[PDB]
C-alpha cells in the first residue's frame, strides 16, 4: 500500500515535472 | 450625506467584490447559518433518536446518504429553539432532538427572504426593472409550501423533507405511495413548466448560437462579441424563418420570447406549490371515483391507473414500519400485499 | 430542367411554408402514420395483453379511460422483441389483442423524429446557418430512444417500453425505480440537475433580459411594442443586466458575453439530458443506481439503517406488487 | 505578488483535491459505511 | 539468476522512468541538443537490450 | 471594484508562508476533533458500540416532547 | 510557437487539436501517440487483471474484460473454460505494454521534434485533405492492414490451436476449425437477417465455422478493397455526393464507429458464442431461462408434473407455447424463448423443449449450470452490489456483460453526437458559413417571405 | 496472480492502468503553463 | 395480409429511394454560399 502510493506519487509527478523542467529552461512549450 | 443612517447606507452600498446592502444584514447570517447548519449536521449529527437512522459522515454515511433529518413525530410542530422547553439550552440534546432541522429550515426561510430583498435592492441601485426578484417568488413558494406548509398541515415536522440527497428521494416515493402525487394536475403543470423551461433554455441558447452573425475571423466565435456594441449578435430574421419552416411557428418579438422564458418555469413552480398546499391536508388527487366503481364491480377491468394504485399500496405497507417508527407498526408477513412469487 | 431536377428543387426549396427536404421525405409519412394510428388507438383500441398473461389492460377512451388513465399499451410480453407488423397477425382482432399498434406507432415515430433531427441540420444548411440546433434536439430524441427502444432491447421486450399515455408513463417510472433504483443513479441525478438547472437559467435569462428592456413604449402600451421584428439594434442592455447579476452574486459569476452566455444556456440542459438518456440506456443493461442497503453496521453487527434503507423499503413495495400475476419464480431477472 | 506561477498553484491545489477525494472513496470500502 | 533478473527488470523500470521525463524535455529544449541526441540514442539502445534480457531471463525465473 | 486580485494574492510568497501553516493546522485540528472522540460528545452521536445495549431489540426513539431530553438521558444510561 | 495560440490559428485552447488540421507531421504525432495510449491500456490492464486473478473463481466473478477476450481465442484454457495456464495472458499484456513505449516514442517524436508538416520533406507521406487520390490510397493501405488482421484470426483458428468453442460436442473446449463456412449464401445471408427477435442479424452467429468463414471473406474483401483504392480515384457521383475535407472524413468515421459501438453493445448482450458465458457470465436471457429451468428441475424432483401444471394466469407454470407453437419456459421468461445455450439444447426437440427429455434426461451438470447462471444474472449496482436493486450488500458482482454493454452504449452514443457535430460543421465550413452569417449577404434577406 | 518472480513489481502493476487518465490531466497542466493561449 | 405486406414494402422502397437519390443529387451544392 505504501509501495502503491509511492509508485503513484512518482508517476503522478513525472508529468508536471516535465512541464516545470521545460518552463525553468524556457523550453519549447 | 448627513446623519448616521445615511452614513451607514453609504457603507452598505459600496461597490465591492460582494455587495452587502441592507438586505445583506438579513441575507448573509441566515444563508451562512442554514448552510453551515447543513454541513455541520451531515458531517457529525445522528438521526438515531428521531428516526432510528445514521445520517452523518461520522457514522459512516456518504454524500448521497447523509442528512439533517426532521425531529421526532412526538415533537409536533415545535419551533425546537436551542433555549426552548425541549432542549433547555443543552446543545448536545438539541442536536439529538432534531434542533438542526428547524434551525436550517427557519434560517433558510429568512435567508431566502434576504436574497429576494437583495434582488429588489440591487435592481433599484442599478436602475433595472425587478423581474429577477419577481421570478424568484417561485423558488420561495416551493420552499414555503414544501418545507413549511406541508408539515404544518401534517401531524408534525417529522413528515417534512429531511435535508439530504437520499432523504429527499424518500420524500418523493412517500408522495407517490401515500398521496399519488404523480396523478395531481398541479404537479403535472409543475412538470410542464420545469421541462418546458429546460426546453426553452436549450432551444434559445442553441438558436442564438446557430444564427450568429460573423463578426470576427476566429473559428471560435466567442471573441466576436462586444458588450457595448449596438447590434444584435445573431439574426432574429433567420432564426424566425428557420423555426417557422421547421416547427410551423416561431418567435418574432424578442421581448415576448424573454418574457415567456420567465413566465413558463415560474408559473410551473407556483402550480406545484398549490398542489403541495393541497397535500398538507391530504386533499389529494388520489383516485378517479368512476374507475373505482367500475373496477370494484368488474374484476376484468384494468387500466394503468389501477396498476399504479397496487404499486402505492405496496409502497405504504412495505415502507411505513421503518419510515414511521413512532407508529410501532407491526405488520405480520401474511398481511403484506404481494403478487405471485415476489 | 428535367422532371427529377424540378422535384429536387421543390423538395429542397427554401421557400416552402414548411420545409420539406430529404429528411422530410422520410419524416412526413412516418410521422403521419404514427400520429394517425396513435389517435385512433387512443380513442378506440380494445384492451392489450401487455404482460402476455392473458390479462388485457384497457388503454382507450371508449373502453373506460379518461385523458389521464388512457394509453396506447405496449405489445405483448409473449412477442418480446419479435417484429409484429400488421401482416404478421392472422387478423386485426389478433393484432389489437397483442398490442400491435404500439410497435407501429413507436417505430414510425422514432424514424420520423430521427428525420426531424436530420431536417433541422438540413434547413440550417439551406439557410446559411451554423448547424448545431439538431445537436440540441439529440437530447430529447436520445431520451425517447431510451424508453421506447433501448430499454426494451436490454430487457428483452417491448412490453417493458414506456407506455404511450400519462398514467402509463408513471407506471413505467415506478417499476423502473423498483428494478434499477434510478433515483440513486448519478446519470439520473445529472438529468435532474439538467432540467432543474434548465428551468432555473430559463427563468434567470428571461428575467435578466426583460428587466433590461430599453424604454421604447408608453406607460399604457405593452413593452413588446418596444421591439420590432428584424430591427438591427439590440432591444435590451446586456451591460445593465451584467451590472445587476455580477453584483447579485459576484462580478465573474456573471456573463457579459452574450455568445458564451447563450452557449451555457444550450449546453447545460442538453448535456444533463444526455446523461438522463444514458442513465435509462445503461440501466437498460442492468447497471443500476448505487446500493447502500445495510451499508452502516454497528460494533456487534446490527444493521443501522440510513435513508438509503428507507428508499429500499419503498422500492420493495413496488417490486412485490408490480405485475402481480406475472412472476412464478422468486427473482425478477428482466 | 507574482513569485509562484499560477499554473503550479493550480496543479498542486488540483492534486490535493484528488488525494482528499480519493481518500473518501477508499473509506467507502473500509471501516464504517463499507457494509462489512 | 533470480537476483540477476530482478535488478535487470528494476533497471528497465528505472531507465524507463528517466526516458519518460528525459525524452520530452530533451526534444523541447532550446540549447542542449548535441549531448541530448546521443543519450536519447544511447538510452534507447540500453532500453531495447534490457527488454531482451528480461525476456530471456524470464524463462529461468519462471 | 478595489480589492487586490486573487491572482496576485495566491501567487505571492507571503501568502504561502502564512497558509503553509494555517491550512495544515486547521486540518490537523479537524482530525483531532474526530480522533480524540471529541466530535461524538459535542454532537451526541453514538460510536459503533453505543447504538444499542447488548440485548436490546428496539430503537431509543424519543416519544415525549417536553421530557425527551430526559428520555435520551435514560436511554443513554442503559448501554 | 507557429500557430499555437488563438490569434494565429483562430481556434481557442479548448478546440486546440483543430490547430492540427493542416499540420500533417504534428498530426501524425497525435495519432501515433494515441495508439500508444490504446496499446498501453491493453497491456497494463491485462497485467492488472492477471495480478488480481484467482484461477479457481470464474472470470466473470472477478471484473475481467480482457482475459476473457484472450481465452476466447483459445489461450490459456481447456475443457469447460478451465484455466490451464496463465502465461499466454501474461505474454499478451507484456508485449502490448512494451510495444506502447515504441508507439509513445514515435508519437512524442513527431508531435514535438520532427517536421510539423510532411509535404516539403516527403511526397509519399505528405498529404492534402483535398487530394482525393492520396486520401483513397491511405485508406487503401489501412484496408489491407485490416484485412490481414482478419486473416490472423483465421490463422489462429485453423493453424495455431483453434478457438474456445462453447458449443464443442461433449462440453465447451478449444477446437481447431478445419471446415470454415465459405458459401456466400450463408455468410452474406447473415447480413440480410432481420435485427428483431428470434433473428438478430449478425448478432445471431451461433457457430465458429461461420465466424471463421466470415473473417476469411472480410480479410479478402478488405485486401481487395485496399488494392482497388490504391489503384483508383473517386468516380464523379462520389465526388458530387461528399464533403472532401479533414473534418468531414472524421465525421464519416465518427458515424461508423458509433454504429459499430451500438452493434458491439448488442453483441455482448445477446451473443454467447464469441462471448462464451463460461468467461463472460450468462446473458440476461440465459440467466432468466436458467431460473425457470432451475425451478422446473426442483419442483419435478418434488413430484410435480411440469407439463400439466397450470399457473395462476391459466398459462403453464413451467412450460407453455410460443406464439408459433414451440414449447418454451413459462412465467416472465416467455420473452426469452429465442435464447439458445449449450446447457439447454440437449432438452430441445423439433417442437421446442421436449417433455420426454425433461422428465428423464436432465443431467446434474445441467442443473448445476442453470443454478450458476440464474445466480449470476447480469444485474447489479454501480458500486458493484450484485443482485436486484433491493438486494442487501454481500455479493460483489456486476457482470462483464453489463460493463461492456453500458460503456459501449455511452461511447456509441457520444460518437453519434460527434458525427452530427462534425458533419454539420464540415458542411458549413465547406460552404463558408461556419463562423456565422455575413451581415451584408444574409441569405434569408434575399428570399421571398413565407406569408 | 503474476508469476512469483514478478510479485515484487505487483504494487507497480496495480497503479499502471490509471496512467492514461494522467495524460488527459497533463494537457491541462501544460495549457496552464502556456496561459491557455 | 400478403397484399398489405407487398403494398407497404413498395411504399417504403419508394420513399427510401427518394431519400437516397435525393441526397445523391448534388446536395452539397444546395446551399446559399459557395457551390
Ligand atoms: C446507416 C444507418 C442508417 C439506419 C437506417 C435504419 C435501418 C433500420 C435499423 C433497425 C433498428 C434496429 C431495431 C431493433 C434492434 C434490436 O432489437 O437489436 C437486437 C439485435 C440482437 O437481437 C437479438 O439477437 C439474438 C441473437 O442471439 C441468439 O444467438 C446467440 C448465438 O450465440 C445466442 O445463442 C442467443 O442466446 C440467441 O438467442 C436473438 O435473436 C434475440 O432474439 C434478438 O432479440 O441486435 C442487432 O441486431 C444489432 C443491430 C442493432 C443496433 C442497435 C440499436 C441502437 C439504435 C441507435 C439508438 C441511438 C439513437 C440516438 C438518436 C439521438
Ligand atoms: C439576521 C440575523 C438573524 C435572524 C433574523 C435570526 C433568526 C432566528 N434565529 Mg438565529 N443567529 C444569528 C442570526 C440570526 N438569527 C447569528 C449571528 C447567530 C450566532 C450568534 C445565531 C445563532 C442562533 C441559534 C443558536 C438559534 C438561532 C435561532 C433563530 C430563530 C429564533 C430567534 C428568536 O426567537 O429570537 C428572539 C429575539 C428577537 C427576535 C430579537 C428581538 C429584537 C427586537 C426588535 C428588540 C427587542 C429587544 C428587547 C426589548 C430588549 C431586551 C429585553 C429585556 C428588556 C428583557 C430565528 C429563525 C434559534 C433556532 O433556529 O431554533 C431552531 C436558535 O436555537 N440563532
Ligand atoms: C420573500 C419575502 C418578501 C420580500 C422579498 C418582500 C419585499 C417587499 N416588501 Mg414585503 N412582506 C413580507 C415578505 C416580503 N416582502 C411579509 C411576510 C410581510 C408581513 C405581512 C411583508 C409586509 C410588508 C409591508 C406592510 C410592506 C412590504 C413592502 C415590501 C417592499 C420593500 C421592502 C420591505 O419593506 O421589506 C420588509 C422586510 C422584510 C419582509 C424582511 C423582514 C425581516 C424580519 C423582521 C426578520 C424577523 C426575525 C424573526 C423575529 C425571528 C423569529 C422567527 C420565529 C419563527 C421564531 C418589497 C416589495 C413595502 C412596500 O410594498 O413598499 C411599496 C410595504 O409597505 N412588506
Ligand atoms: C491524446 C491526447 C492528445 C494528443 C496525442 C495531443 C497532441 C498534440 N496537441 Mg492537443 N490537446 C489535448 C489532447 C491531445 N493533444 C487536450 C485534452 C487538450 C485540451 C487541454 C489539448 C489542447 C491543445 C492545444 C491548445 C494545442 C494542442 C497542440 C497539440 C500538438 C502539439 C503539442 C505541443 O506543441 O506541446 C508542447 C508541450 C511540451 C513540450 C510539454 C511536453 C509534451 C510531451 C509530448 C509530453 C510527453 C510525456 C510522455 C510521458 C513521454 C513518453 C516518452 C517515452 C516514450 C520515451 C500535438 C500533436 C498544439 C497545436 O496543435 O500545435 C500546432 C496546441 O496549440 N493541444
Ligand atoms: C471500455 C471501457 C471499460 C469497461 C467496460 C471497464 C470495466 C471494468 N473495469 Mg476497467 N478501465 C478503463 C476502461 C473500462 N473498464 C479505463 C479507461 C481505465 C483506466 C482508468 C480502467 C482501469 C481499471 C481499474 C484500475 C479497475 C477497473 C475495474 C473494472 C471493473 C469494475 C469497473 C467499476 O467498478 O467502475 C466504477 C464506475 C466508474 C468509475 C464510473 C465511470 C463513469 C464515467 C467517468 C462517466 C463519463 C461518461 C463519458 C465517458 C463522459 C463524456 C462527457 C460528455 C460531456 C461528452 C469492470 C469489469 C476494476 C476491477 O474489477 O479490475 C479487475 C478495477 O480495479 N478498470
Ligand atoms: C504509422 C505511423 C507512422 C507513419 C505513417 C510514419 C512516417 C514517417 N516517419 Mg515515423 N515513427 C513511428 C510511426 C510512423 N512514421 C513509430 C512507431 C516510431 C518509433 C519507432 C517512429 C519514429 C520515427 C523517427 C525517429 C523518424 C521517423 C521518420 C518518418 C518518415 C520516414 C519513414 C521512412 O521513410 O521509412 C521507410 C521504411 C522503413 C525504414 C522500414 C520500416 C520498418 C517497420 C518498422 C517494420 C514494419 C512494420 C509493420 C507494418 C508492423 C507495424 C506495427 C503495428 C502492428 C503497430 C515518415 C514521415 C523520420 C522523419 O520524420 O524525418 C525527419 C525520422 O527521423 N519515424
Ligand atoms: C473503410 C472502408 C471503406 C471506405 C471508407 C470506403 C470509401 C469509399 N469507397 Mg470503397 N470499398 C471498400 C472499403 C471502403 N470504401 C471495400 C472493402 C471494397 C471491396 C468490396 C470497396 C469497393 C468499392 C467500390 C467498387 C467503390 C468504392 C467507392 C468508395 C467511395 C464512395 C463510397 C460510397 O458512396 O458508399 C456509400 C454507399 C452507397 C452509395 C450505397 C447506397 C447506400 C445503401 C442503401 C446503404 C445500406 C447500408 C445500411 C446502413 C445497412 C448496413 C448493413 C447492410 C449490409 C444490409 C469512397 C471513397 C466507389 C468509388 O469511388 O471507387 C473509386 C466505388 O465505386 N469502394
Ligand atoms: C450550526 C450551528 C452553528 C453554525 C455552525 C457553522 C456556521 C458551521 C459552518 C461549517 C462549514 C462552513 C463547513 C464546511 C464544510 C465544507 C466541506 C466539508 C467541503 C467539502 C467539499 C468537497 C468534498 C468537494 C467536492 C467536489 C465538488 C463539490 C465538485 C468538484 C469535485 C469535488 C468532488 C472535489 C452555530 C455555531 C452558530 C450555532 C449552533 C448551530
Ligand atoms: C503529444 C502530446 C500529448 C500526449 C502525448 C502522449 C499520448 C504520449 C504517450 C506516451 C506513451 C504511450 C508512453 C508509453 C510508455 C511505456 C513504457 C515506458 C513502458 C515500459 C514497460 C516496462 C518497463 C515493463 C516492465 C514490466 C515487465 C517487462 C514485466 C511485468 C512487470 C513490469 C510491468 C514491471 C499531451 C496530451 C501530453 C499534450 C501535449 C502533446
Ligand atoms: C465477419 C463475420 C461475418 C461476416 C461479416 C460480413 C460479410 C460483413 C459485411 C459487412 C458489409 C458488407 C457492410 C456494409 C456496410 C455499408 C454501409 C454501412 C453503408 C453506408 C452508406 C452510407 C453512409 C451512404 C450515405 C449516403 C446516402 C445514403 C445517400 C447519398 C449521400 C451519401 C453517400 C452520404 C459473419 C456475420 C458471417 C459471421 C460472424 C463474423
Ligand atoms: C438502395 C440504394 C440505391 C443504390 C444506388 C447507389 C449507387 C450510386 C449511383 C450513382 C449514380 C447517380 O448519380 C447521381 O444521380 C442524380 C440523378 O441521376 C444526378 O442528377 C442530379 O444532378 C445535379 C447534381 O448537381 C442535381 O442538381 C440535379 O437536380 C439532378 O438531376 C446526380 O448529379 C448524379 O451524380
Ligand atoms: C436601526 C435602523 C432604523 C433606522 C430608522 C430610524 C432613523 S431615525 C433618525 O436618525 C437620524 C440620523 O440619520 C438622526 O439625526 C435623527 O435624530 C433620527 O430621527
Ligand atoms: Cl405494474
Ligand atoms: Cl417468472
Ligand atoms: Fe437571449
Ligand atoms: Mg469508511
Ligand atoms: Mg497487489
Coordinates of C-alpha atoms in Angstrom, one line a residue, chain G residues 54-205:
Chain G
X54 CA -7.7 -16.2 -8.9
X55 CA -7.9 -19.1 -11.5
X56 CA -10.4 -21.2 -9.5
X57 CA -13.1 -18.4 -9.4
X58 CA -15.0 -17.7 -12.6
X59 CA -13.5 -14.8 -14.7
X60 CA -16.9 -13.3 -14.6
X61 CA -16.8 -13.0 -10.7
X62 CA -13.5 -11.1 -11.0
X63 CA -14.3 -8.0 -13.0
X64 CA -12.4 -9.2 -16.0
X65 CA -12.9 -8.0 -19.5
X66 CA -9.6 -8.6 -21.3
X67 CA -8.6 -12.1 -20.1
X68 CA -12.0 -13.3 -21.4
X69 CA -11.0 -11.9 -24.8
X70 CA -7.7 -13.8 -24.7
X71 CA -9.3 -17.1 -23.6
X72 CA -11.9 -17.0 -26.3
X73 CA -9.1 -17.1 -28.8
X74 CA -8.2 -20.4 -27.1
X75 CA -5.2 -19.2 -25.0
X76 CA -4.8 -20.4 -21.5
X77 CA -8.0 -22.5 -21.2
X78 CA -9.2 -26.1 -21.6
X79 CA -12.4 -28.1 -21.3
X80 CA -15.3 -26.1 -19.8
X81 CA -13.2 -23.0 -19.9
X82 CA -10.9 -24.2 -17.0
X83 CA -7.8 -22.2 -16.8
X84 CA -4.8 -24.5 -17.6
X85 CA -2.1 -21.8 -18.0
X86 CA -2.0 -18.0 -17.3
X87 CA 1.3 -17.4 -19.2
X88 CA -0.4 -16.5 -22.5
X89 CA -2.4 -13.9 -20.5
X90 CA 1.0 -12.6 -19.3
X91 CA 2.6 -12.7 -22.8
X92 CA -0.3 -10.7 -24.3
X93 CA 0.0 -8.0 -21.6
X94 CA 3.7 -7.6 -21.6
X95 CA 4.1 -7.5 -25.4
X96 CA 1.3 -4.7 -25.6
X97 CA 2.9 -2.8 -22.8
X98 CA 6.4 -2.9 -24.4
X99 CA 5.0 -2.0 -27.8
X100 CA 3.3 1.0 -26.4
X101 CA 6.6 2.6 -25.4
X102 CA 7.6 2.3 -29.1
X103 CA 4.4 4.0 -30.3
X104 CA 4.7 6.5 -27.5
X105 CA 8.3 7.2 -28.6
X106 CA 7.3 7.7 -32.3
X107 CA 4.3 9.8 -31.2
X108 CA 6.2 12.1 -29.0
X109 CA 8.9 12.5 -31.6
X110 CA 6.6 13.5 -34.5
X111 CA 4.4 15.6 -32.2
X112 CA 7.3 17.6 -30.7
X113 CA 10.6 17.1 -32.7
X114 CA 10.0 16.0 -36.3
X115 CA 8.8 18.3 -39.2
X116 CA 5.4 19.9 -38.4
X117 CA 4.4 19.3 -42.0
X118 CA 5.5 16.4 -44.1
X119 CA 4.8 17.7 -47.6
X120 CA 8.1 19.6 -48.0
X121 CA 10.0 16.7 -46.6
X122 CA 8.3 13.8 -48.4
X123 CA 5.6 13.4 -51.0
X124 CA 4.9 9.7 -50.1
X125 CA 3.9 10.6 -46.5
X126 CA 2.7 14.1 -47.1
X127 CA -0.9 14.7 -48.0
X128 CA -3.5 17.3 -48.7
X129 CA -7.0 16.5 -47.4
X130 CA -8.4 17.7 -50.8
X131 CA -6.3 15.2 -52.8
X132 CA -8.9 12.6 -53.5
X133 CA -6.3 10.2 -54.9
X134 CA -3.9 10.4 -51.9
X135 CA -6.9 10.0 -49.5
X136 CA -8.2 6.8 -51.2
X137 CA -4.6 5.5 -51.2
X138 CA -4.0 5.9 -47.5
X139 CA -7.5 4.4 -46.8
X140 CA -6.3 1.6 -49.2
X141 CA -3.2 0.9 -47.1
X142 CA -5.3 0.6 -43.9
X143 CA -7.8 -1.6 -45.6
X144 CA -5.0 -4.1 -46.4
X145 CA -3.8 -3.9 -42.8
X146 CA -7.3 -4.5 -41.5
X147 CA -7.7 -7.4 -44.0
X148 CA -4.5 -9.1 -42.7
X149 CA -5.8 -8.5 -39.1
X150 CA -8.9 -10.5 -40.0
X151 CA -6.8 -13.3 -41.5
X152 CA -4.7 -13.5 -38.3
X153 CA -8.0 -14.6 -36.5
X154 CA -8.4 -17.2 -39.2
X155 CA -4.7 -18.3 -38.8
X156 CA -5.2 -18.7 -35.0
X157 CA -8.4 -20.6 -35.6
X158 CA -7.2 -23.0 -38.2
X159 CA -3.4 -23.3 -37.8
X160 CA -2.4 -22.1 -34.4
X161 CA -4.5 -24.1 -31.9
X162 CA -8.1 -23.1 -32.7
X163 CA -10.6 -21.1 -30.7
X164 CA -12.7 -21.6 -27.5
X165 CA -15.9 -23.4 -28.7
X166 CA -18.7 -23.2 -26.1
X167 CA -20.7 -25.5 -28.5
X168 CA -18.0 -28.2 -28.7
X169 CA -19.7 -31.6 -28.6
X170 CA -19.3 -33.2 -25.2
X171 CA -18.8 -29.8 -23.5
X172 CA -17.1 -26.5 -24.2
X173 CA -13.4 -26.8 -25.3
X174 CA -10.7 -25.3 -27.6
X175 CA -11.1 -26.7 -31.1
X176 CA -9.4 -26.4 -34.4
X177 CA -11.6 -25.0 -37.2
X178 CA -10.9 -27.2 -40.2
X179 CA -14.0 -26.6 -42.3
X180 CA -14.8 -22.9 -42.2
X181 CA -18.0 -21.6 -43.9
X182 CA -17.2 -20.4 -47.4
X183 CA -20.7 -20.4 -49.1
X184 CA -21.6 -16.7 -49.7
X185 CA -25.3 -17.7 -49.4
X186 CA -24.6 -18.3 -45.6
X187 CA -22.0 -15.6 -44.9
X188 CA -23.9 -12.8 -46.7
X189 CA -27.2 -14.3 -45.7
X190 CA -26.5 -13.1 -42.1
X191 CA -26.3 -9.5 -43.3
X192 CA -29.8 -9.7 -44.7
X193 CA -31.3 -11.2 -41.4
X194 CA -33.8 -9.1 -39.6
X195 CA -32.4 -7.4 -36.4
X196 CA -35.6 -8.2 -34.4
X197 CA -36.3 -11.1 -32.0
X198 CA -35.6 -14.6 -32.9
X199 CA -33.5 -13.3 -35.8
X200 CA -30.8 -10.9 -34.5
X201 CA -29.0 -10.1 -37.8
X202 CA -25.3 -10.8 -37.4
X203 CA -25.6 -11.0 -33.6
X204 CA -27.1 -14.4 -34.2
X205 CA -24.0 -16.1 -35.4

